[PDB]
Amino acid sequence: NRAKIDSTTMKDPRVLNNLKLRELLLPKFTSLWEIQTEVTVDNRTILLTWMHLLCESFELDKSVFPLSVSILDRYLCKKQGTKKTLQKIGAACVLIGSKIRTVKPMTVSKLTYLSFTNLELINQEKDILEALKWDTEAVLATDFLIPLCNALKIPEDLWPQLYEAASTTICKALIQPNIALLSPGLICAGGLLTTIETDNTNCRPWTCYLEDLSSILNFSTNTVRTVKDQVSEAFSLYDLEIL
Amino acid sequence: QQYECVAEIGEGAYGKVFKARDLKNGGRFVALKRVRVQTGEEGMPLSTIREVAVLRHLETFEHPNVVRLFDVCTVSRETKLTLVFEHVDQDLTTYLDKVPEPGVPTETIKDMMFQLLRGLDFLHSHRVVHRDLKPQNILVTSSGQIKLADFGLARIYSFQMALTSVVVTLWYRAPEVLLQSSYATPVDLWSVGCIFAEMFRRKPLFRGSSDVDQLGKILDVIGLPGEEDWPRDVALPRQAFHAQPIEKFVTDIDELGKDLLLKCLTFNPAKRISAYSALSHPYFQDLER
Numbered sequence: 001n002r003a004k005i006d007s008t009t010m011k012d013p014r015v016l017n018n019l020k021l022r023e024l025l026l027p028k029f030t031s032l033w034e035i036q037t038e039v040t041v042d043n044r045t046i047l048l049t050w051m052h053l054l055c056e057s058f059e060l061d062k063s064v065f066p067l068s069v070s071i072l073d074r075y076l077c078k079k080q081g082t083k084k085t086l087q088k089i090g091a092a093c094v095l096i097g098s099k100i101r102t103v104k105p106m107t108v109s110k111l112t113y114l115s116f117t118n119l120e121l122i123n124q125e126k127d128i129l130e131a132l133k134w135d136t137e138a139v140l141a142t143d144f145l146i147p148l149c150n151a152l153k154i155p156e157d158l159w160p161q162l163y164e165a166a167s168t169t170i171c172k173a174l175i176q177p178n179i180a181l182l183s184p185g186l187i188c189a190g191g192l193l194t195t196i197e198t199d200n201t202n203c204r205p206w207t208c209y210l211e212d213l214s215s216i217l218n219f220s221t222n223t224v225r226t227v228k229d230q231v232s233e234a235f236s237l238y239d240l241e242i243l
Numbered sequence: 244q245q246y247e248c249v250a251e252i253g254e255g256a257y258g259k260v261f262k263a264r265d266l267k268n269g270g271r272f273v274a275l276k277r278v279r280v281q282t283g284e285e286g287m288p289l290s291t292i293r294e295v296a297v298l299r300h301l302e303t304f305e306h307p308n309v310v311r312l313f314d315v316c317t318v319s320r321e322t323k324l325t326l327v328f329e330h331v332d333q334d335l336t337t338y339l340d341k342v343p344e345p346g347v348p349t350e351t352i353k354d355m356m357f358q359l360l361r362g363l364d365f366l367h368s369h370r371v372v373h374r375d376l377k378p379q380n381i382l383v384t385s386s387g388q389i390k391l392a393d394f395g396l397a398r399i400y401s402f403q404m405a406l407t408s409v410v411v412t413l414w415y416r417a418p419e420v421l422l423q424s425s426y427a428t429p430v431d432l433w434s435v436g437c438i439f440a441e442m443f444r445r446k447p448l449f450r451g452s453s454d455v456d457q458l459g460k461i462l463d464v465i466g467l468p469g470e471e472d473w474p475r476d477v478a479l480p481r482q483a484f485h486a487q488p489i490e491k492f493v494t495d496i497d498e499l500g501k502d503l504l505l506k507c508l509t510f511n512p513a514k515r516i517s518a519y520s521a522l523s524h525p526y527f528q529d530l531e532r
């Protein structure tokens with residue numbers, strides 16, 4: 001498989017302005033899984049640990065898991081889910097998410113053998129799509145990594161390694177419910193800072209882009225730091241013993 | 244259920260594309276792209292999903308140069324997935340024929356090439372790559388407006404993302420693609436160039452039979468690159484092959500335009516002009532714009 005390299009027109013202009021823009025197009029207005037009356041947040045944290053495990057194990061593109069979570073939350077704003085139904089609902093979000101953001105899709109057999117019939121998953125993928133009016137795609141926390149590095153003037157020869165870790169921790173951080181509040185733009189920043197920190201990549205003290213990030217994302221500096229602390233938290237709270 | 248199929252207007256690969264009427268508006272014509280979702284076991288076809296996803300994700304922007312997606316019909320009865328788009332009077336290949344001699348007027352070919360670059364600038368500015376540009380995928384309205392269509396292969400392009408070994412008919416595939424290397428937004432610039440060079444002379448600029456013949460036809464024009472513009476990544480050497488004036492192929496092209504057609508048909512992708520800068524290029528200095 002041929003992985004993609006830098007494209008100066010895709011990640012060097014004012015793609016950032018547009019990412020910030022497209023971000024503010026999924027207004028929040030409602031709480032996390034607010035409507036659900038039978039599944040809780042702790043159920044989400046669990047479900048998400050299994051989805052994260054699925055995407056990591058199968059080496060799917062870093063963008064799959066955070067698109068899967070997006071679908072899942074959105075869908076659970078319009079339809080009800082039951083305790084014995086989440087696993088399948090989530091399976092289906094990974095199916096959809098992977099079909100889009102990665103070259104070799106996660107098949108139905110791969111998700112069934114892991115739990116429904118290979119026709120129960122299918123009617124689930126369907127019920128999710130109609131629910132979202134097929135409006136599947138979205139702005140992912142993971143989308144900001146490069147744009148921010150560039151805007152932050154971080155040197156390109158670092159990008160690959162910097163990107164590699166940043167993505168990983170951000171994915172683990174998204175498992176935590178406290179992060180679903182934050183916007184993908186901030187969630188990313190915090191993730192970059194966190195990665196920059198616990199691994200000096202010849203990057204001036206992580207506490208340098210602290211401003212640029214603020215001037216860039218338009219929030220203050222207390223905001224960016226707070227987020228850096230949160231993502232680092234969500235990251236450490238990641239624990240397989242919940243499965 | 245309420246769409247009376249009038250006639251096929253070309254068929255894709257996983258489903259034909261019929262033009263139909265509907266009881267929604269008098270006799271309104273909406274483009275119908277119905278995909279055969281055979282009950283294999285994979286669920287909804289990936290293509291159908293990416294496409295609708297992308298289109299549906301930017302719609303709010305109501306960009307002029309992007310085709311509009313009306314609806315998605317699905318009968319659970321295999322299952323039949325019918326995607327309903329807007330209907331334009333004809334695609335570009337159809338226009339590039341029914342045009343009186345001697346072809347399209349040098350100014351009309353400039354106004355579409357602009358509109359065509361306006362869709363890509365938009366697309367790319369949102370990290371999207373329409374990996375399948377070709378005359379058949381461009382909708383030309385009677386009014387003269389240009390619409391990009393068939394986002395079947397379109398996808399949100401992110402760093403270190405893995406890539407499939409194939410896309411773009413052939414006569415529009417970019418060298419890097421024909422070589423089995425990485426790729427990105429530049430692929431569409433190569434196509435736009437091919438489509439640009441194709442608007443003057445009403446016929447494909449690089450019609451080839453295979454990967455070697457196509458790669459050779461392409462080079463047979465731009466000329467063998469330099470040991471610095473060939474992938475160090477993989478495949479056939481640059482020796483694998485052994486610089487004719489671009490006009491010799493494009494029946495009379497303006498010195499500034501002929502300069503643009505080459506900026507798009509640049510072998511090394513990183514040196515290939517971007518749709519952004521392309522809308523700034525001198526070849527557009529004076530259009531009704």
Ligand SMILES: O=c1c(O)c(-c2ccc(O)c(O)c2)oc2cc(O)ccc12
Nearest residue numbers: 252253274328329330331333334392393
């Ligand atoms: O009016 C047309 C149209 O809307 C589409 C179209 C729209 C969305 C797609 O995804 C697609 O593959 C084709 O094609 C065409 C092809 C022709 O020869 C002529 C007219 C149209």
